[PDB]
Every structure is written in structure tokens, then in C-alpha cells.
Amino acid sequence: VRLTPTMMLYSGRSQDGSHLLKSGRYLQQELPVRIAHRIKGFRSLPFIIGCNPTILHVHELYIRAFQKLTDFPPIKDQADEAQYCQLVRQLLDDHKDVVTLLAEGLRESRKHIEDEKLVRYFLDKTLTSRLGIRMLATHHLALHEDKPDFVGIICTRLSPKKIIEKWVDFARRLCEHKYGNAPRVRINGHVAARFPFIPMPLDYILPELLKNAMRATMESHLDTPYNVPDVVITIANNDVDLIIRISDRGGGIAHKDLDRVMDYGFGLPTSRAYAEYLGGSLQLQSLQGIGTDVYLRLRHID
Amino acid sequence: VRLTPTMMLYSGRSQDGSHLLKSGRYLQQELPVRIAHRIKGFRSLPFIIGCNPTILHVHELYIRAFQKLTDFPPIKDQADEAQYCQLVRQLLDDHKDVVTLLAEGLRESRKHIEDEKLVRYFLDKTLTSRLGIRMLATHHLALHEDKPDFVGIICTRLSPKKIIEKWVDFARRLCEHKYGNAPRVRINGHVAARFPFIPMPLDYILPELLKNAMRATMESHLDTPYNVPDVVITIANNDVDLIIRISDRGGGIAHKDLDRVMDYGFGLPTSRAYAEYLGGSLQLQSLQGIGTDVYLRLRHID
Ligand SMILES: CC(C)C[C@H](Cl)C(=O)O
Ligand SMILES: CC(C)C[C@H](Cl)C(=O)O
């Protein structure tokens, strides 16, 4: 009992494993319908783009997914549900590179793009539906796990500070490897906050935002990489949403680039679409000559 | 030679005072036309609002202004221009309370307001035109002054830090008088920047923004007024615009109030309309539970 947009994540308990069958049967009815919607998206692409060999390949993954899914017989016991999980697992892996295949197929296809609002809409709808589908699927699998402080993929006691720190260490390493240093990150605000929340969207978004804030900081301090401005992260936790402000002193996004930056890495426009999909937002405040403030808002689970 | 939107401020030099006659004759043709546009605005008000005695009074100031202006004969020498200045001076003073009279007339008139986009449009158009008219008029008068680092109302060497500091001292005093203390203000970024710029819009806007940031800070620290979070102002100066970010730790503007706050003190919605009128913007980022960031952008003079 809990939801993403129009999709339900099951918070349940059954010592017989009754909840696993109910969740399995839900996932089994919901997946094919949503995969078919993805097939329609490909069908309605401008012909010339839909013809691109990589776009066509991704199109074919979805048909294949829909075939295997609809071919699976209904679930009438635990044993069915178990094998169904195996299928779902295989599909999640087969589809792991999809975002990357799309970004490539569409680049090969840049010249033939006449209407950009049309393709941008396709990407947003595809990528965000894909996310929802993957959360729902991953949730069901994670219900088989016995891990504490987790109901499926819902973490019952999530520390925004903690999950930010993990992605900071990650982004710092990439940055140190490329520039030989990385900005110290400071975290302020509600650093002690804990509340139920689904990690996954944060796991996509944060590393992107952290990579940008760090890149921009280094690219504008080439002369002094051993000494660069800190990246300052602020956490604001209230009853409606969680806000994570990420501020860098990297010189800002230039006026001429302001529009190009939020459109299709490819990490920012995806991140914004994810945030809105979940009922939040991703906004940018550029101080040209100084730095950039990025505001990630995500609604509280309920 | 220099401009606000569709209006020209004259940067000129004449030892005979030839520039004063050219500016005077420009101001004399431009004022009546723009006052008449203000009269149309009142004429097109919903009857029931336009009937309010205070709204009617302001309406009558404008007609009166337009009469005295059109009655003034053309300017053919320095002596005419001098008396014209006297008239313009008198009008600027007669009209000094207009914003306040409007805000009052419309409050008396709240119940009868059916379409809010209509009135909001009237206010924006009136208040922002009024500003432009007052800049143009004040500029002409200031051309009579011999003050250094000033061509009329254009300051040739304006320090954003300096003008911010003046409004900080001002807002601090009001705040100390009401709460018995006030937040320390810190200024960072391009604190050494200097460039031609027209002070006036900053003189309206900054004190409003500073009053809010300080009020919000005190209202959320009632227990400890002797010790409150600093207000942090950041100046970003580039070739396109000037950005002044004003950040407070006053708990943010609550979700439920987010829309009500930018609509018609009355200081924020005016400030935003002024900023856009001049080709800039005024945007708010609320971190509910923590504070608010306000971003004032104003285009560089050119
Ligand atoms: C069959 C599903 C799980 C595939 C999802 Cl929609 C994805 O593209 O990864
Ligand atoms: C006649 C002019 C100078 C009046 C201006 Cl538009 C104002 O209302 O103050």
C-alpha cells in the first residue's frame, strides 16, 4: 500500500508469503500494459527516426519484453511467482542499457529531427515510464529480500545526508581521477533527518548533479586544482517534500547556454524528467561569473 | 543616448546648455502621451472598482497631470525649460503617494474583484509605467545638477556592494527598532565591481527584499533574537546582467503561501514587476524548514 504516479508499491507482510503472490499477480497484469504503451511511443515516432537501427533495436527489445511477459501464464501459486521473478530479473538486465541506446540512436538521428518538442516528449515519456516500471519491478523482487530497514525498495529510515555522502564519495573519486583533485563537499540544514523514502530516484539524480557541480568547479579553477571552492549542499526537510540544494562556485551556466543545458549526458534533462514524474522538480539558478545553485525537490512518500 | 524599455535617457554635454533644451523638448512630448496611456488604464477598469473614491482620486490626479502638461506651451528657450522643470517637480511630488493610494483603493475594493488577472495586469502596467515615467522625469531634472559620478540619474561608477550596504543599514535600523536586534548581513562574490547603472530601481527593490529577509529571520528566531542566522548576499557581475542573491535562514515561505506571496506590501509583486519591466527578473527559491533564496537580476545599462 503506497504509490508512485498511477502505480502502487506494496507494503505488505505475510509469513505464508501471501503478499508475494498478490504483488506478483499485480506486477503481472501491470507490466504488459505499460510495456505496450512504450511500444506505442516507438510506433508514433517520425518514420525517419524510428528507422534508425539502434532506435529500432530498442523498439525490438520492448516487443520481445511484451511477448515474454504476455506468454508467461497466470500465477496461481508460489512456484509460478518464483519463476516469474526470474523472467522479470532477466528483463531488467536486458533493458539496463536502454537510456544509453536511445541517446545514441537519437544522436545518429540528429540531422533528421525537424520537431524537437516531439522527440523531447518521446524521451521524457519513455525514460520516466521506464523508471516507474523499473521501480515497481525492483520493488517486487526486493520483497523477496529479508534486509532490515527496507520494505521492498522503500527504506523506512532513510538519511538524506547518508545517501548524499555515498554519492559524494563516488563523484569525488571520478573527479580526483580526472583532475587530480576534487572539491570538498559540505552538508548543512536538516543533516539529522530520517524518514521513509525510496532511494532509487536519488540514486540516479544525485550522482549527475554531484558530477556537474564538481566538474564546473574544477573547469573554472584549472590554475589551482589543489585549492578550489567547496560544494555546499543544503537539506531542507518538511512535511510536504524534501529539498536538496546543491551550490557550486564554478562560474555559473552562461546565458547563451541556459536553454541548451536543460535539453537532451543528458543527465540534467533526465534528472528533471525523473523529478517531475515523481511529483517533484529540478530547478537551476545560475549566477554568471560565480556559480550555480541546483534545487532538487522530491515529494514525501505517502 | 541610453534607454529603459521604449524610453530614452539622455547622456549629454553642452556648455551652452543645449542638451537641456533637447532633453526638455523630448520629455515634453513623451510625458503627455504616457500619462494618457495611464488614463486609458483607469478608463478600462471594471466599473465597480473604477468607482472606488480613492481609485477615482488617483484617476483624477492623472487627468490633472495631463491637463497641466498639455497646457504647458512648447519650449523654445532655456527659460521655458526652467519653468517646465518646476511643473515636472510639482507633479512628481503630487504623485509620490500613488502606489499607496492604489493599494488602498483596491483593498476597499477586494470583495467586488471577480477577475484577478485583470486587476493584476492593471497594477503591473500602471506601477511599471509610473516607474519609467518617474525615471525619465527625474533624469531630466538631474541633468541640471552638477554632481560627480552622475549623468542625470545614471551613476557612472556604481558599486552594488555600496548601494546594498546603504539599504542594509536602513533595513537593520527598522528591524532593530521592532525586534530589538537584526541579522548581521554578509556580502560575497563580486564585492569590488563598479559599472554604470541607474540606482533608482535598486532603491525601490533592495529595501523590500532586505526587509523580508530580516523579518523572516526574526520571526523564526523569537526565542533567541540576540542570536540569529546571518543574511547572506551574493553579487554576481557579468557582461549581460547583475545578479544579487539574497539568502535568509528564516524557515522558508510555506507551500500553502507560495502563490499568495508573489501577488498583490505588496513589496514583492511590485519588485518583480519593476525587475521585468527593466528586462530583469525576480525569482524565489523556498527551502521549507530552512529559509529562502531571492534572486534579483537586472540587465546592464546599454
Ligand atoms: C521489461 C521492463 C522491466 C523493462 C523496463 Cl521498462 C526497462 O526498459 O528497463
Ligand atoms: C506626471 C507624472 C510625473 C506622474 C508619475 Cl507617472 C507618477 O505617478 O508619479
Swiss-Prot record, chains A, B:
Coiled coil: none annotated. Autophosphorylated. It catalyses: L-seryl-[3-methyl-2-oxobutanoate dehydrogenase] + ATP = O-phospho-L-seryl-[3-methyl-2-oxobutanoate dehydrogenase] + ADP + H(+); L-seryl-[protein] + ATP = O-phospho-L-seryl-[protein] + ADP + H(+). The modification N6-acetyllysine is found at residues 125, 166. ATP binds at residues 212, 248, 265, 268. The gene is Bckdk. The chain holds residues 68 to 404 of 412 of the full protein. Homodimer. Homotetramer. Dimerizes through interaction of two opposing nucleotide-binding domains. Interacts with E2 component of the branched-chain alpha-ketoacid dehydrogenase (BCKDH) complex. Competes with BCKDK for binding to the E2 component; this interaction is modulated by branched-chain alpha-keto acids. At steady state, BCKDH holoenzyme contains BCKDK and BCKDHA is phosphorylated. In response to high levels of branched-chain alpha-keto acids, the inhibitory BCKDK is replaced by activating PPM1K leading to BCKDHA dephosphorylation and BCAA degradation. One of its GO terms (cellular component) is mitochondrion. Belongs to the PDK/BCKDK protein kinase family. Keywords: Acetylation, ATP-binding, Kinase, Mitochondrion, Nucleotide-binding, Phosphoprotein, Transferase, Transit peptide. It is found in: Mitochondrion matrix; Mitochondrion. Its main location: mitochondrion. This is Branched-chain alpha-ketoacid dehydrogenase kinase. The keyword Mitochondrion applies. One of its GO terms (biological process) is L-leucine catabolic process.
